[PDB]
Amino acid sequence: NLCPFGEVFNATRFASVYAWNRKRISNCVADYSVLYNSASFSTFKCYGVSPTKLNDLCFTNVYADSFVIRGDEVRQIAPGQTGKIADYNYKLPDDFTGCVIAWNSNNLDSKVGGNYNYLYRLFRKSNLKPFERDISTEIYQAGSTPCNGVEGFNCYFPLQSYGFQPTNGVGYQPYRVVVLSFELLHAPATVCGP
Amino acid sequence: QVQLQQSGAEVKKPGASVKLSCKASGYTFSVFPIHWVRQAPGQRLEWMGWHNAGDGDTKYSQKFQGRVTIISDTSASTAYMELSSLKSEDTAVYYCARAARPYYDRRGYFFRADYFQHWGQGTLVTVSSASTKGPSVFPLAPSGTAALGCLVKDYFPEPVTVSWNSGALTSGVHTFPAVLQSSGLYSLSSVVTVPSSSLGTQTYICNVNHKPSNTKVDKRVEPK
Amino acid sequence: DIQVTQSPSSLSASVGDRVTITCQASQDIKNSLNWYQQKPGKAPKLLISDASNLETGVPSRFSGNGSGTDFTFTISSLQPEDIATYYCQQYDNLITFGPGTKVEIKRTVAAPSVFIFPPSDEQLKSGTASVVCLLNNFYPREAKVQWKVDNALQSGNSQESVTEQDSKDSTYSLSSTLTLSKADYEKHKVYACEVTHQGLSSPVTKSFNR
Ligand SMILES: *[C@@H]1O[C@H](CO[C@@H]2O[C@@H](C)[C@@H](O)[C@@H](O)[C@@H]2O)[C@@H](O[C@@H]2O[C@H](CO)[C@@H](O)[C@H](O)[C@H]2NC(C)=O)[C@H](O)[C@H]1NC(C)=O
């Protein structure tokens, strides 16, 4: 009856950007008031709809995308943006209808030695299309000579680890991001606010 | 299809009264006798009385006569039972059951056919001096296979529904029966066995619903 | 008043076994006796009416016999779906239900997996501490659970709850809860749960230090 937003926002740890997690929300009543009344969020930007008008609205399906980026990459989670995250990890459509929600997670996703469990795709031969995910681990050809499946000179592993340390600056600290996408199709609307 | 729909659960203080409804559907409600049977928690079934709507025939048990009354409204196809002077021992689930039609034999003798082929879902009636109170939910945290859970403590009355991960996690879950403490409040535990590798990976949230108090608590059980 | 007795009071039988339970009335009730089945958490269901007649939709492994004062109910081959309490009911004069016979599945001996849970910080802030011990998926049902606080046996502060026999593995699970005040919880160190069960070669103890 109540939509499982807490499973996404309050999860023990989030996914890496390259393998961003998506939750399909359906057949439930969603109270977005628990989100647009909290002061815990450093970034709360919605496109195509105001959060205040969301509680009296109905959609076919609602998607909640989850990942952890660094602070100076949160601006890339916006329509028509560029950068390693927008081009190689998570891209929003230009006509995106939804909300981008982010908050600092240095207390949870930073370790004294450095939390090297969060990764991002550094190299890709092409830019990602909107809402596309690439979890591949194929060696990247950064030069003329072919890699043939083994790492070497100008032949790199595609993913790179954030070295999230508690002593890092804010822009380099981990930030947890939730992107809500609101889908309205020629079908019965099943995610409705109160 | 024959269906006997009973009223919702009721909470009463000692000495008060309770009126229960049993709506009949899918058959001629007027001609079939409806019996009322109660069952204390973990106890045997106890017949209380029967009543036929079209006949007006009524018979109560000796134990409940004077404090019980069974009527009916044929237009609404609903039988009513009212128990008065309630005591704590009246705490039970009260069923309405439909019997077969009575008959006469070759020699003209009247025979009843009181085998109960159709039952209602039962109405829980809790009689206690305690007042309705919502539960406090505390995490039972883990330290091969691991166990975690939630403690649903100090609530009244029964029942409480406990789900895990918004209804997804069902395998390995054991929601234990509640126990009545001396304070008059109930306490209950819900546990689930999970792989120790997943202790990290998956987030485990128990969802507790206490509809009597309109209390819904979602608590995450994380390893400390 | 007509009295109705049932024997045995409880029963354990393996899958496929023949199960026969009896019902006795204090007077001649002719053949006006019915048999009901009540699975845990559900309403009663009529299986046999007027001593011998099987009701529609009830499996043929269920049968009934008897007339006068002595009646019998038989399951030809016990199935796991037959875990329930079975009541007889007379209606020769008024209605009198029987005390019931609890039917369980006899399964191979299974030892319990034991877990102990310390009190949560949220509850300690309330001024009360609750230690919970879990016995998971064991058979038979009989098991001793001893709370030991600094190796001192704790009595009068424990409560136990057992689940019904599981739908799949026919096992039981047990929850024991030791509730103390925060003051009494902070004057002790080692909190342990000692468990004795037939499937264990020796008692198993799960503990923690405050
Ligand atoms: C995500 O969690 C916050 C905080 O939850 C609290 O702390 C957790 C560790 C856990 O113990 C919860 O049970 C706690 O409630 C939620 O915000 C809380 O919402 C409740 C709801 O009534 C409110 O009473 C508290 O004051 C709130 N606490 C704070 C710090 O704001 C939040 O709602 C959760 N998000 C979602 C989407 O469910």
Numbering used by the authors:
A (entry chain A): 334 to 527
B (entry chain H): 1 to 52, 52A, 53 to 82, 82A, 82B, 82C, 83 to 100, 100A, ...
C (entry chain L): 1 to 94, 96 to 211
Share the article's original sentences.
To understand the basis of the broad reactivity of ADI-62113, we determined the crystal structure of ADI-62113 in complex with SARS-CoV-2 RBD at 2.6 Å resolution. Despite differences in heavy chain and light chain variable germline gene usage, the binding mode of ADI-62113 to the SARS-CoV-2 RBD was similar to COVA1-1611. The somatically mutated VH R100b has multiple interactions with the RBD where its aliphatic moiety interacts with the aromatic ring of F377, and its guanidinium group forms three hydrogen bonds with the backbone of RBD 369YNS371 and the partially negative dipole at the C-terminus of a short α-helix in the RBD, as also observed in COVA1-1611. An extra residue is inserted in the down strand of the β-hairpin at residue VH Y100e and creates a G1 β-bulge, where the glycine residue in the bulge is in a left-handed α-helical conformation. VH G100d has a positive phi (φ) angle (φ = 88°, ψ = 11°), consistent with a glycine residue in a G1 β-bulge, that alters the backbone conformation and enables a hydrogen bond to be made between its carbonyl oxygen and the hydroxyl of the highly conserved RBD S383. Importantly, the YYDRxG motif contributes a combination of polar, hydrophobic, and amide-π interactions with the CR3022 site, providing a structural basis for the potent and broad neutralization against SARS-CoV-2, VOCs, and other SARS-related sarbecoviruses. All of these RBD epitope residues are highly conserved across all 169 sarbecovirus sequences analyzed and are largely not changed in SARS-CoV-2 variants, which supports the broad-spectrum cross-reactivity observed for ADI-62113 against sarbecoviruses. Even although their epitopes do not overlap with the receptor binding site, they can sterically compete with binding of human ACE2 receptor, which may in part explain their relatively high potency as non-RBS antibodies in neutralizing SARS-CoV-2 and VOCs.
